[PDB]
Amino acid sequence: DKCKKVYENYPVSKCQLANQCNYDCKLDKHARSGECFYDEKRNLQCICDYCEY
């Protein structure tokens, strides 16, 4: 939680690529590893991680 931050304002099919997630997040949310997960909406939620993951 403290090291995790969900950005529902940035779920993109492009995120389907664990590569785009961290790269794009770094550019947008400055996330360290930008990790995306699948929610109930079957959408890719961009969860910025800080060190812990």
Side-chain angles (χ1 to χ4, degrees):
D1 295 351
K2 295 184 187 174
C3 319
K4 302 292 202 315
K5 302 185 194 190
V6 190
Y7 283 91
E8 302 83 2
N9 323 323
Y10 286 86
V12 197
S13 66
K14 294 186 185 194
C15 305
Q16 71 195 44
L17 302 179
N19 295 318
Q20 290 288 324
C21 294
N22 77 316
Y23 265 90
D24 299 350
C25 289
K26 281 162 179 168
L27 295 169
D28 293 346
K29 311 302 194 162
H30 307 113
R32 295 192 188 205
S33 242
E35 297 294 343
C36 278
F37 299 83
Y38 301 72
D39 68 354
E40 296 76 15
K41 307 183 188 63
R42 316 305 324 275
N43 98 318
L44 310 174
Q45 296 292 348
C46 301
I47 310 185
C48 309
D49 72 37
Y50 293 69
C51 324
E52 294 77 18
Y53 74 90

